[PDB]
Design a protein around this nucleic acid. Structure first.
Lengths: 49, 106, 96, 111, 127, 171, 50, 197
RNA sequence: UUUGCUCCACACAAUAUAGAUGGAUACGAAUAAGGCGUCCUUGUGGCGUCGCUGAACCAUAGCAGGCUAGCAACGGUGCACUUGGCGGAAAGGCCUUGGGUGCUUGCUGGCGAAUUGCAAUGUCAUUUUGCGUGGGGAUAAAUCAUUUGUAUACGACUUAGA
RNA sequence: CCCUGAAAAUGGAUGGCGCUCAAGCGUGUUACCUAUACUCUACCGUCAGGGUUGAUAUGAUGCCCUGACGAGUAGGCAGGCGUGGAGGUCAGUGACGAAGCCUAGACCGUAAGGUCGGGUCGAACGGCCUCUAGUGCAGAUCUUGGUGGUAGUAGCAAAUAU
RNA sequence: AACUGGCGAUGCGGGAUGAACCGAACGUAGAGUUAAGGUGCCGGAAUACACGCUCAUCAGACACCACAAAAGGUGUUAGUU
RNA sequence: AAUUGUUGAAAGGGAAGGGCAUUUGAUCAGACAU
């Protein structure tokens, strides 16, 4: 039988699996698309909240 | 010379089989030269050896041989049937096989 | 993308050498000994490696670490991370 | 069934290779003319060629000669039946029915 | 030194085992014909254990002959060992299992004197 | 089926009421004598009131082609039973012999109309020797003066499973 | 685990010395007989003439 | 007949090439297929894309990690097409698939060797001219292959280096042909001519 | 950490083999077009030649490939070195210089083969390991336990302690 | 022939891969693959028809010849294997070890089962001709007895507190 | 319900798979030939030969069988008047 | 006997077991010796 009253699904399915991180420092998966015009500079930094 | 081979190389294809039942008594050999039963008809009487190696040395050597003979042609692609004294192991499908020229008729 | 080679600095701080051990208090602290000895004789191997990086390196990332001893945190083991250099060509990045 | 009119060659080869008698309700092979003379000496059939003659030319004692001949047990035709599917009439591109003159090749192959 | 015989051909080997004797311990390995209705052994399906039939019967000329070419004949003492004096090349004496060693030595001596082969000469020998 | 053309003469069984009956002759394209006789009896059955149990075949003789080498243009009339009804058709085929023309007719009809041999009547195959009697473009096309066409993109059957250079399809 | 008949060696020396003269009448037969036969790659014993 | 046979993938039809290669692999020949990004499938690009999308739609409902793995690289697409042909669930099939290596482009270990083609599985020999066909690399990069350009650039570099090598090979082969031509008409060459060489 | 570990050379033994038994012999691109040689104005040029399969090409003779003599060339090839480059896509290979040494069937000779008895794969490859040789080379960690809470049901994670 | 008509629910099935001058559709001709089918042979058994008095290595229920056949639940019949007990016999086996029990040790029979070796063991047991039956187990939510996985798991948490 | 043949009581090759369909019925083995069904690979057997048709932006692929209709197309081919 | 411990052998990518055939390992009878 169909769901009597529609409702949006709970939670977000694109963040699965909800396991622990591999390490206490999250990896920067992607980096800004490099262009070879501006001077050389870092694309990130590390800090402590 | 650097080549001492006196046998034609061949590949052990499979046991004679229907769609779902295989007969281990008769094996199939694909000889590297023949490509038609007319050319396969030459090799019918020839002796066949499967040569393998084992870790235990018996009767003077670690190399053992299972002997057999070609029996008749198979199909239109020159495959031949082979009958061995003891049937070839099913692990040797695609293994190499020496088809000697004896007995000869030329 | 696959890493080709990493070239380290001659002298590594204690707070970043700690990252390479789990038991720093009793370790012999031998990390990068036979590598800091490679910077001797004007670092011929080091410059050769950098030249090979320039020859075959499409993306350049730099290993850096935080001076965590400057923070009030109790942990003295620094964090090491790769930050991509965005700028001139590969030679400019590695020279920088 | 597949049936036709056999030639003398087919009949002779059949009698020579797969010729079997019916002595004492037992299927004995037509090995010597003595066997045929013992049973069919009443009708004048003295030899295996006498039997073949009484078969090929339907004669006064054809019934007796053919009854004495045991039903021939023929093998499958060497080289197949020449057809993908047997169970259609030979006229319909099959194998059964009155093959007439073509029966000789089939019987020789099946011998 | 036995009677000439044709090749001993065993039509079957690998003793016919009872169905499910491997699966269940209560089921003994002695053969018992399955009487069930929907049984894949009573209905001889492909890939199931073969059943004993009369077609496996050994040749009447090679029946009961040991690989040595004799038929084993049980002997309990010298008196029944003497029954094989004139049939040395057909029957081979086999000492019964309950014969004492001090009698088996006598049996073996008498048999070797008469030429009768004993299939178990190493029985209870304290050598 | 590599047909052979047979000419079969038969008749009704003579009786004392009317001995010496009227011989009827047919030309049948069949694979062999058995099928030729069967088709003859079929056609006589559908034409006149006579069946094999009531008549006889006085003769059956194969016709070989007069000029098995000279290329001709046969015009064929054929009726066939489609999935819905029976249609009469005229097609012309340019071939070498009557039997070859009938064979290619059978292949062509099976290919273009799914008409098996059991549902085809060869009304008449007759050589047309005057040009401009041709009326189908697929045959008028090959009667052009000084005809020459190429055969582009030739692919060679390989006797070995591996060809060691990338082949070319010139010609 | 551990020689030739003198008669046999003399018959061999006479037969081979009688056959060598016959061998020498053709250009490459002696070298040919010194060589040893061996199937090479691509050889087809069903199509190789002898 | 060689131990390892390298198959040039360009211009080949996926199904026929796989059907040939599966039988060879079961026969025991070691096969390395190169240039998988320029394989060919009959039919037009949109049709083959729709077929691959229908394949993508099929996955395990309750846990997608257990369902069919829809590999997108051209080498893996051809490998799936071949594993469907080889009885991979048995040890025989596992050994056969172990005897096989499939690459996109031509790797360094095999760019110095001789690449062969299969005439029974060539597009230019099997497809009637005018039939639309697809390039496996284009199909893969449409359905989500991330390395079309980084393979094209390496193919350009490899072809450049191979052209430099082939120039030298052609020069030396012309020298050899000229030198052999002078030795022709000689006594030994004339004697060889009667024997066929 | 008392002669443990790694690497180099051979030496024995074990260990197996999805299966050596002459060579995996490198453009690219199109097929209703190309390859190669050649000429010039260098072109989407001209001319010539080839295909029609790798049935090719290379290699191939010697005790499973011996010991020796010479002729003719200054080649071909193996080996250990040496010189200089190219190669990062899975480079781990490709070329190259120099001399040394070995063979050379390019050509003509001399000696040996037997007896494995009429065939019996008649054993010649590489994969790993172990112990020996004698020659170098390098002299740490991790975990438990204690501790922190940026973590946690327990494991795990994050810290700190000569 | 193809297309529209042509909409169903887990992801999905010309069996699958995959196939496009087909590995599709229609048709034709060959070659080839294989069933416990057919042909020939061997062997087992059954049935049938026969031969054999000769003293007989005996036994005519014995030996031998010929031909055909062999599927099967319910069921019928026949020939046999095994167990407790009884009559007869082997002047049977046995404390120099009977019976029992263990025995990926051996032999025989198609099989029921029979025999032998090895270990344990301690006091009775077997072959044959017959007789007799409380005589053959995988089931019956079978009876009794014994023991497993579950499983070192659920859990051993009300009545204030040590 | 009628006739017959089967399954039940029946295994074997084929229809992937199935009590009934196709072939064929069974002692144990060896050799040969086939049935039904097939010969791109799984899979043993011709990526055989030959004549044509079809391009589908939901093709088609073999009987029982695992469906498709009425009506349409200047898709294409062969035809009739 | 079920069931269990140790030792020994062998195998083990979501069952184990079985039939046909052979390789491999372990084990074993008989016969020439007459």
């Amino acid at each position: 039988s169909h769901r009597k009253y529609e409702a949006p699904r709970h939670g977000h399915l694109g963040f699965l699996p909800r396991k622990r991180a591999a390490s206490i420092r999250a990896r920067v998966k992607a980096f800004p698309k490099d262009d070879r015009s501006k001077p050389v500079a870092l694309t990130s930094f590390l800090g402590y909240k | 010379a650097e080549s001492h081979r006196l046998y034609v190389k061949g590949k052990h294809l499979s046991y004679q089989r229907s769609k779902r039942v295989n007969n281990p008594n008769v094996s199939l050999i694909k000889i590297e030269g023949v490509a038609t039963p007319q050319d396969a008809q030459f090799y019918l009487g020839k002796r066949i050896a499967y040569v393998y190696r084992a870790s235990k040395e018996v009767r003077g050597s670690k190399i053992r041989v299972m002997w057999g003979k070609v029996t008749r042609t198979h199909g239109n692609s020159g495959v031949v049937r082979a009958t061995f004294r003891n049937n070839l192991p099913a692990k040797t499908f695609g293994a190499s096989v020496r088809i000697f020229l004896y007995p000869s008729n030329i | 993308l696959r890493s080709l080679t990493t070239v380290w600095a001659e002298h590594l701080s204690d707070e970043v050498k700690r990252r390479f051990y789990k038991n720093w208090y009793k370790s012999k602290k031998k990390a990068f000994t036979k590598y800091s000895a490679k910077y001797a004789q004007d670092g011929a191997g080091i410059e050769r490696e950098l030249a090979r990086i320039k020859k075959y390196a499409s993306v350049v990332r730099v290993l850096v670490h935080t001076q965590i001893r400057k923070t009030p945190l109790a942990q003295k083991k620094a964090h090491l991370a790769e930050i991509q250099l965005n700028g001139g060509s590969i030679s400019e990045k590695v020279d920088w | 069934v597949a049936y036709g009119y056999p030639s003398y060659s087919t009949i002779r080869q059949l009698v020579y290779k797969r010729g079997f008698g019916k002595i004492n309700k037992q299927r004995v092979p037509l090995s010597d003319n003595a066997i045929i003379e013992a049973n069919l000496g009443k009708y004048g059939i003295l030899s295996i060629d006498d039997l073949i003659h009484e078969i090929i030319t339907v004669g006064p004692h054809f019934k007796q000669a053919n009854n004495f001949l045991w039903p021939f047990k023929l093998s499958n035709p060497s080289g197949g039946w020449g057809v993908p599917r047997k169970f259609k009439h030979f006229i319909q591109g099959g194998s059964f029915g009155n093959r007439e003159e073509f029966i000789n090749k089939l019987v020789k192959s099946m011998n | 030194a036995s009677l000439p015989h044709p090749k001993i051909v065993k039509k079957h080997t690998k003793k016919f085992k009872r169905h499910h004797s491997d699966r269940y311990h209560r089921v003994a390995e002695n053969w018992r014909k399955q009487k069930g209705i929907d049984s894949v052994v009573r209905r001889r399906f492909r890939g199931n254990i073969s059943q004993p039939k009369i077609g496996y019967g050994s040749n009447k000329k090679t029946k009961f002959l040991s690989p040595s070419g004799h038929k084993t004949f049980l002997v309990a003492n010298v008196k029944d060992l003497e029954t094989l004096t004139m049939h040395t090349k057909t029957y081979a004496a086999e000492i019964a299992h309950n014969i004492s060693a001090k009698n088996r030595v006598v049996i073996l001596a008498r048999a070797k004197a008469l030429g009768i082969k004993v299939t178990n000469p190493k029985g209870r020998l304290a050598l | 089926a590599h047909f052979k053309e047979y000419q079969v003469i038969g008749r009704r069984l003579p009786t004392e009421s009317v001995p010496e009956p009227k011989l009827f002759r047919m030309r049948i394209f069949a694979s062999n004598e058995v099928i030729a006789k069967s088709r003859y009896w079929y056609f006589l059955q559908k034409l006149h009131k006579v069946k094999k149990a009531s008549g006889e075949i006085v003769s059956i003789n194969q016709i070989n082609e007069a000029h098995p080498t000279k290329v001709k243009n046969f015009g064929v009339w054929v009726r066939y039973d489609s999935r819905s009804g029976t249609h009469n058709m005229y097609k012309e085929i340019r071939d070498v012999s009557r039997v070859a023309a009938v064979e290619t007719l059978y292949q062509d009809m099976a290919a273009r109309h799914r008409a098996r041999f059991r549902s085809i009547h060869i009304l008449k195959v007759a050589e047309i020797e005057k040009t401009a009697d041709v009326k189908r473009q697929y045959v008028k096309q090959f009667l052009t003066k000084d005809l020459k066409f190429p055969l582009p993109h030739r692919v060679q059957k390989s006797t070995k499973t591996f060809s060691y250079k990338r082949p070319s399809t010139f010609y | 685990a551990k020689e030739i008949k003198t008669e046999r060696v003399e018959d061999q020396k006479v037969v081979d010395k009688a056959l060598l003269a016959e061998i020498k009448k053709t250009p490459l037969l002696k070298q040919y007989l010194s060589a040893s036969f061996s199937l090479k790659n691509g050889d087809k014993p069903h199509l190789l003439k002898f | 007949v060689e131990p390892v046979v390298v198959i040039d993938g360009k211009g080949h039809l996926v199904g026929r090439l796989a059907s040939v290669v599966a039988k060879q692999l079961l026969n025991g020949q070691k096969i390395v297929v190169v240039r998988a990004e320029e394989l060919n499938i009959s039919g037009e690009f949109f049709r083959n894309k729709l077929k691959y999308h229908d394949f993508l739609r099929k996955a395990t409902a309750f846990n997608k990690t257990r369902g069919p793995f829809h590999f997108r690289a051209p080498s893996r697409i051809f490998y799936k097409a071949l594993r469907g042909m080889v009885s991979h669930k048995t040890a025989r099939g596992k050994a056969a698939l172990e005897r096989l290596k499939v690459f996109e482009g031509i790797p360094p270990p095999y760019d110095k060797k001789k690449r062969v083609v299969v005439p029974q599985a060539l597009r230019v020999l099997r497809l009637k001219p005018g039939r639309k066909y697809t390039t496996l690399g284009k199909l893969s990069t449409s359905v989500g292959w991330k390395y079309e350009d980084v393979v094209a650039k390496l193919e350009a570099k490899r072809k450049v280096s191979s052209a430099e090598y082939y120039a030298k090979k052609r020069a030396f082969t012309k020298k050899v042909a000229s030198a052999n031509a002078t030795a022709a008409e000689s006594d030994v060459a004339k004697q060889l001519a009667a024997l066929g060489y």
